[PDB]
Amino acid sequence: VVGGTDADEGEWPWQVSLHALGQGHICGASLISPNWLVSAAHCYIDDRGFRYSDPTQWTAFLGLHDQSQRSAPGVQERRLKRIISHPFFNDFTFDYDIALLELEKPAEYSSMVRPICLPDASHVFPAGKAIWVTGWGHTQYGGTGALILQKGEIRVINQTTCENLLPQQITPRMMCVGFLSGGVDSCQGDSGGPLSSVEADGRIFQAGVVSWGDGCAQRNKPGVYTRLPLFRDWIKENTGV
Numbered sequence: 001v002v003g004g005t006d007a008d009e010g011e012w013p014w015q016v017s018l019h020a021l022g023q024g025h026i027c028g029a030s031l032i033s034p035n036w037l038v039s040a041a042h043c044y045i046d047d048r049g050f051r052y053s054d055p056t057q058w059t060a061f062l063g064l065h066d067q068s069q070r071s072a073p074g075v076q077e078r079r080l081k082r083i084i085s086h087p088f089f090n091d092f093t094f095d096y097d098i099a100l101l102e103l104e105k106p107a108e109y110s111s112m113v114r115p116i117c118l119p120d121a122s123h124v125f126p127a128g129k130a131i132w133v134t135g136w137g138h139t140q141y142g143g144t145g146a147l148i149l150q151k152g153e154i155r156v157i158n159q160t161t162c163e164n165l166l167p168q169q170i171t172p173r174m175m176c177v178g179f180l181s182g183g184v185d186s187c188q189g190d191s192g193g194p195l196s197s198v199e200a201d202g203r204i205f206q207a208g209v210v211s212w213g214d215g216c217a218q219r220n221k222p223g224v225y226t227r228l229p230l231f232r233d234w235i236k237e238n239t240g241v
């Protein structure tokens, strides 16, 4: 997260950290139920030197605050039983960049580990609404990750403006969130994390999945996120949640 600040401990109990065998933190995810997490499909694409698609190559840390303190009280460690990438995901266009990760063993709800609420299919997060992006990603484009979880406040951007800012690249499954002037944006390592939207009663709903961006916090290059409402039914049919 670029342009953010340290989150308070336990402030985002649904934020999950995903480590790949021997590589440390690679992606974030969100707790949506005792056995399921939501993340981005691009995190689980194999490459010649590592099978990111293999659930056994990953470890999920729930309740984590500081990467250098992964054993602290309240932190839970879990392995993945399965990784379900959206069948329509496209590595080139990045359309349908969303994934469901099934935990090997049930997460235990506590004050530091709590699921985020999922928005119904017809819900629309309005342009201009303040949203929160969180993660252990780089704090600068061309910088380094963060030990302490970061949070940044950004705003939903009009779809038309989004398409126009990134011509031939924005699909209806994507949503621009941030600022045209930059300043605050998610970045490398934040991929797969959730956008948290405070709703009518104070409860927080996932407004999106950190997907991609041209650089980070660059002027006229806001972060692009995968929408959640559009996948409510997909999530239900695959996870029962």
Ligand SMILES: CC(C)c1cc(C(C)C)c(S(=O)(=O)N[C@@H](Cc2cccc(C(=N)N)c2)C(=O)N2CCN(C(=O)C3CCN(C(=N)N)CC3)CC2)c(C(C)C)c1
Residues within 6 Å of the ligand: 042, 043, 044, 045, 046, 047, 052, 185, 186, 187, 188, 189, 190, 191, 210, 211, 212, 213, 214, 215, 216, 217, 222, 223, 224
């Ligand atoms: C080599 C390619 C893919 C690549 C593309 C980009 C962008 C121009 C699209 C970049 S980047 O810096 O402008 N942006 C990163 C970091 C990022 C991430 C999320 C949000 C933001 C934001 N500013 N809001 C930024 C980026 O949008 N990605 C997405 C695409 N990407 C991948 O799909 C890799 C995932 C891991 N992997 C496998 N498991 N096989 C290889 C492919 C990497 C990060 C980069 C960076 C890494 C130099 C690379």
